[PDB]
Amino acid sequence: MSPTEAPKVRVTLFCILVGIVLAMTAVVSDHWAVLSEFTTQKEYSISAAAISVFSLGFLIMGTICALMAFRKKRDYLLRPASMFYVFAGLCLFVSLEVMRQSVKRMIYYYSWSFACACAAFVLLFLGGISLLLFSLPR
Amino acid sequence: FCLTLQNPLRKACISIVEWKPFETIILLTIFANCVALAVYLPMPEDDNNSLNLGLEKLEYFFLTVFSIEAAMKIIAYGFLFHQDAYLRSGWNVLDFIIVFLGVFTAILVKALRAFRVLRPLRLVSGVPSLQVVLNSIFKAMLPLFHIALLVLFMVIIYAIIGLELFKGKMHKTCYYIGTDIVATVENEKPSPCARTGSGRPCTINGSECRGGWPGPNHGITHFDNFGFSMLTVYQCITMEGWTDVLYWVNDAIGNEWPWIYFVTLILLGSFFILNLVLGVLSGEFTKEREKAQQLEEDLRGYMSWITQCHDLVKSRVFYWLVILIVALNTLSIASEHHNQPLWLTHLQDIANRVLLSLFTIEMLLKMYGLGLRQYFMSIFNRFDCFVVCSGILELLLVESGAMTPLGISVLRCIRLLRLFKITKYWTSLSNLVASLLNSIRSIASLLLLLFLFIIIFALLGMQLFGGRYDFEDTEVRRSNFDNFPQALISVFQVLTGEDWNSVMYNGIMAYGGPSYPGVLVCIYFIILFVCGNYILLNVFLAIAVDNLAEAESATWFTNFILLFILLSSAALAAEDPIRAESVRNQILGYFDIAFTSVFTVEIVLKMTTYGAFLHKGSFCRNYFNILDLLVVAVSLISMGLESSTISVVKILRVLRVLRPLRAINRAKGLKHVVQCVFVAIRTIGNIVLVTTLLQFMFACIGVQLFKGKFFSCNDLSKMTEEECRGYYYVYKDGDPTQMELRPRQWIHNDFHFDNVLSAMMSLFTVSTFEGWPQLLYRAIDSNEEDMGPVYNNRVEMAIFFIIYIILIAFFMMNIFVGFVIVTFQEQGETEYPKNPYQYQVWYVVTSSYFEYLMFALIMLNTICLGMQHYHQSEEMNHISDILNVAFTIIFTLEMILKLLAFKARGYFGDPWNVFDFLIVIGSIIDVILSEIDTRISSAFFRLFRVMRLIKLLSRAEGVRTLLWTFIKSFQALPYVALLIVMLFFIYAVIGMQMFGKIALVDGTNRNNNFQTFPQAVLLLFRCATGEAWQEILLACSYGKLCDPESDYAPGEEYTCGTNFAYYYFISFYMLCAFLIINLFVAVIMDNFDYLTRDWSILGXXXXXXXXXXXXXXXXXXXXXXXXXXXXXXXXXXXXXX
């Protein structure tokens, strides 16, 4: 690989874990929305999303241990798949977000910070994963 | 080879056919065909018929003659004769005629009549060199094929994409519900796309009027069938009327990003048509790369040399010095005409008798020029007349010496033609103009072939669309081939690409609407300009050659401070900060908050920049700064920012963006294209002057021929724009039981030729190829002073618009060529393992027998996508589910197979495989989403399912590689794009308040509102496309009242909230034009400057194949001689290829 592949990813990974925690909080939050089936389905999508995310994280640490003790294309392969799974999980989070938004329309009540935080999380995951995926080619 | 064959009389008759006369006979009788048919088109309207009714025999006459020539063909060469192309087509047409009337005799249908129109091509068939021409045009099509498919690929890819979201919208477009005043909500459940109209309501009824259809009332454009989507994709590619597709879809959920789709589509169709231009110019460079009068002038000049009371005039033939000074005085005389051509013309409708005594001055200038031609007659008598130009100018001055006679005021209008004599100056420029006109002699034949294509297409059209023509309800119908000239103007219409759309939707609508046979009619237009514009594109190459043929012819401490790199670093953090701040200000509402800190930042940057100017000024600048662009730019940055808000408008905050723009100079890549541009404008400025002078010429033409016209009434039923007064009925639709009153009349017709300035105005609009035919048509309704009407009155006037447009087809087309040539010189300046069972499976998969298999799987998936009809009701939907499950399982299975390989490298190694992995992921995810269906985003995921098609492109070797050329090309030009953003990014904001608060309504300003910034980006994006901007311009001259909910003004309203500001759009079209010119040259230099050469190499050498040879080299190691021996077989094999 390249040292920059470490140094640049060193930057992106912070946003990755950041949006990861942001997502964990996004699910965990009881303040999903102020309260003056498709919800469950979107929640399931969130489940597959987070599962894909953790799998991607395993792919990432695996990529680190690999690059530490293997050539590169193997470890890079672990990374690209990680950016991939994290990406699809991210888009899935976007899906659950939009779905929950539309379900909110189906419903007084008000938008909560956890939702937008989830949105920015999925955004950061989107650009970040897009970058790490972009990092693979070069 | 021949056949049968016989001696006797046959050889004698053939010897007679070997002579001469018969040729001329067949040709001229073909001319008789052309004429008789051209008449025959007039008219039709089903039965009736008139004069043609006798011609009906006459086609049998041509039949029997041509058939006799077929009897001669029996004596020709039979099977050997078939080999000739022209003879082939001739024999073909012969079969069409034989089968034609042979069927006709039994009839004692109209398709035969359509087959009649095949005849004219024979005219080409008889003509030498046209075969050379068409054999040339055929060669052109090959080095383009790839891109054509790519267009088709996009045309497919977007279609299938349209066959999803838009098909998901096909559920929306096909239906509606609404009531009451047309105020039903858009894009928020129970909402739909609306018919255009000046009001729109669509009675159905469905409560109080329906409210949403576009598959037929808008005509076919609906995304339901794959075919109709293919259609709407064609017209959207045409950069014509497409935005209406957008406002339609957007009218019905919603303003997410339909725009991403249309913008990518527009930008790419743009990208690759530009690539088409690149292919053509590549053919130019291809022919030219190897392709790269003084005697007679000496004869005439030296005969003039030996050639050298009335005798005093003979002394005056050379004398004197005053004859030079008199030329300066002459500059005054024509100048008096330069105003007079306007002054005699100005004003209009008998307003202002400016020529109160100008006629005497015209007589005086006529007297001076006559004195000059007379003294010149004294200079050498007949020898002075030996030059045609001298007798020409003398005849002109004598023509001005004539009289008020006669009734033809156009003869008085020829005085404007007399102004052309003032063009005699401009040294050397005339020679370049001669070099320009010289090309016309070369291109003229091809132009004639274009005239021929126009002819055949026109006649056939007349016998097709106009071959039915009729369409009950409800005007204006416009051109519809009701008569031969009508078909001329209309074929020439769609040929421009202007609003051909509506023509077409009279076309399909003419055959009872969409179904199965009638929709086939669409194909004509698709045959037409797609080839017709192609023919035009072909024309470029001609000029491209001819034009290139011409080309072939203690202050020191502060000095330490400003120069300090650390100061530049603080300036860099200040750059990111001020950029973030200006970006924060990009929204209109940002000023409402605390923007003042950003003002302090921009003040700091302006301070450091002006200080930089102060630093450079002390070191031999000033006069050098007056010469240098940069220090002058900084000093101008110092003075212009100092301009007061009072007295002449200004806004300092808008300048805040400018301060960092200087950093763009640090980039060097822009400087090459920029220097190329500054070199370019100097290179062809004279042409620009010529164009502007044409603006003057046609101005003078139109004014003293149209000035009384256009003062339109409502409708024709008033004529005298003074007789007009009071109300006026409008019957909706056609039924005389739906009256609606209107205080109608008069009309200013939006673009008076009352003034030569107004002439520059409207003539520029037709110069845009945008909206003109409307102006054309109303120009054809002209008569005398205050009157319109009617139908097809005064058809001769139509000849004019076309004529001018033809000239636009010249110099404009020349303009773009010019840049290219410099670039061509600029380019010349630029030139200056496996194991165990895994070993078994890997062997099975690597063999790539599966490759054709998987390919077929993909194509079958494609056809499964072609299944997408959204009629009614279900059943097949579940089948489609099963199919998607099938392919997704097959594909994921296959990825598992590939996974059972290098793994560490199979999961990457070659990148597309990773992309495939992405595909499998989104596929499976979407499938699970389908399982959970027992949600809106799932469409966006099914997109991923559609994305599979791209894998076909992955198989598209020696095609995708061209896209890789586009990839390597893509990067360097991008720097210009920021300016391409910035040119908008400035003007948009510059307009965002100025043209802001124009009120939503229903004008050109509704779903197309100017309100929020991004929509402004759009409304300025239409103008980039040549999309009906002028109407929008027309809205902005005075506009409406505020946003009708904003701060307004006061009691004031009355649409007073907008005012004149033509300058913005007018200038912007030009800035956009030049900027796009820069886009051309950028794309060219970054691509075809190499990529055209890549075409030349790929068409001949093997630089590309060599990489494949390296791929063969992969199956090896790295030495030694044994490697040479093992590779000796592949090497011995390779060299044969």
Ligand SMILES: [Ca+2]
């Ligand atoms: Ca247009």
